[PDB]
């Protein structure tokens, strides 16, 4: 079926939970043996969210190459994304090692450091120009260059220096700051505006490594971001945009990382964002 009218048909019939459970039943199951090794317990935020072995990002290190991060490669759309958990106190250096080694231009953050009164990820970037951060375990230096605070999101320019080689690179930090503590946003308008700002920066384009996108677990809000982007790109590329099937795209993405889209409300919100975004594109 088309999307917008399939949407109204699920709303009127109140069957979002049944649609979402079908997705969960059909989703791929692949091994995640490296994630479950005992030496990696303090590298995982949640015991039930792990990268598959076949698609995990490897650190360029011979001691321990593990990070909770996955490469999502979308062949027809010609987009790649790295989805990862919010960094932990003992993985902030690994996080920036990955950004460096994979040649990423942008980092997309969809959570606040504290939500619901608890910590959802480490404070992994510097908050003042004159107070830089050094990660001694991976030999990297990180400096805040500039910051632009808007009503729904903040953009930061950061300098990442490889202290072994003295090479430097400019990284863009796109921070969506207004996702509610419970539920999903009422309108997709500010999320779409944010997606378009990431796109306009070059961070999603083939001349750079894959964008790094995270929330707390790296599957819920993060899944929404890449699902919406990929569906809108396919609607631009194809002769028949109504042939884009959002449930099939999501199942394809779940071949590369488990659990993408965590609730039926997140699924409905993804539909809403693609539907509204397709009208603005033209
Ligand atoms: N890119 C891309 C892409 C991903 C999924 C699908 C659905 C396959 O039946 C089609 C295209």
Curated annotation (Swiss-Prot):
Active site positions: 215
- Membrane-related topology note: Peripheral membrane protein
Q: What's an example GO BP annotation here?
A: protein dephosphorylation
UniProt-recorded name of the protein: Tyrosine-protein phosphatase non-receptor type 1
- Shown residues in whole-protein numbering: 1 to 282 of 435
Family indicated by similarity: Belongs to the protein-tyrosine phosphatase family. Non-receptor class 1 subfamily.
Identify the gene encoding this protein: PTPN1
> How the protein assembles, per its UniProt entry?
Interacts with EPHA3 (phosphorylated); dephosphorylates EPHA3 and may regulate its trafficking and function. Interacts with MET. Interacts with NCK1.
Residues where Phosphotyrosine is found = 20, 66
Write down the species.
Answer: Homo sapiens (Human)
Q: Which residues form the Tyrosine-protein phosphatase domain?
A: 3-277
């Amino acid at each position: 079926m088309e999307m917008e009218k399939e949407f109204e048909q699920i709303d009127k019939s109140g069957s979002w939970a049944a649609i979402y459970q079908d997705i969960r039943h059909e989703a791929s199951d692949f091994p995640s043996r490296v994630a479950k090794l005992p030496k990696n317990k303090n590298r995982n935020r949640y015991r039930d969210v792990s990268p598959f072995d076949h698609s995990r990002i490897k650190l360029h290190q011979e001691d321990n190459d593990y990070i909770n991060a996955s490469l999502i490669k979308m062949e027809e759309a010609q987009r790649s994304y790295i989805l990862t958990q919010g960094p932990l106190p003992n993985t902030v250096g690994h996080f920036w090692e990955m950004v460096w080694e994979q040649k990423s231009r942008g980092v997309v953050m969809l959570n606040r450091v504290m939500e619901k009164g608890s910590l959802k990820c480490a404070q992994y970037w510097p908050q003042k120009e004159e107070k830089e951060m050094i990660f001694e375990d991976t030999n990297l230096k990180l400096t805040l260059i500039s910051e632009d605070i808007k009503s729904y999101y903040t953009v930061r320019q950061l300098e990442l220096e490889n202290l072994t080689t003295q090479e430097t690179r400019e990284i863009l930090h796109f921070h969506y700051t207004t996702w509610p503590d419970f539920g999903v946003p009422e309108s997709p308008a500010s999320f779409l505006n944010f997606l378009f700002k990431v796109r306009e920066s070059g961070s999603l384009s083939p001349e750079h490594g894959p964008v790094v996108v995270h929330c707390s677990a790296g599957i819920g809000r993060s899944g929404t971001f890449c699902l919406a982007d990929t569906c809108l790109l396919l609607m631009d590329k194809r002769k028949d945009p109504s042939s884009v099937d959002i449930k099939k795209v999501l199942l394809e993405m779940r071949k590369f990382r488990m659990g993408l889209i965590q609730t039926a409300d997140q699924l409905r919100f993804s539909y809403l964002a693609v539907i509204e975004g397709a009208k603005f594109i033209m």
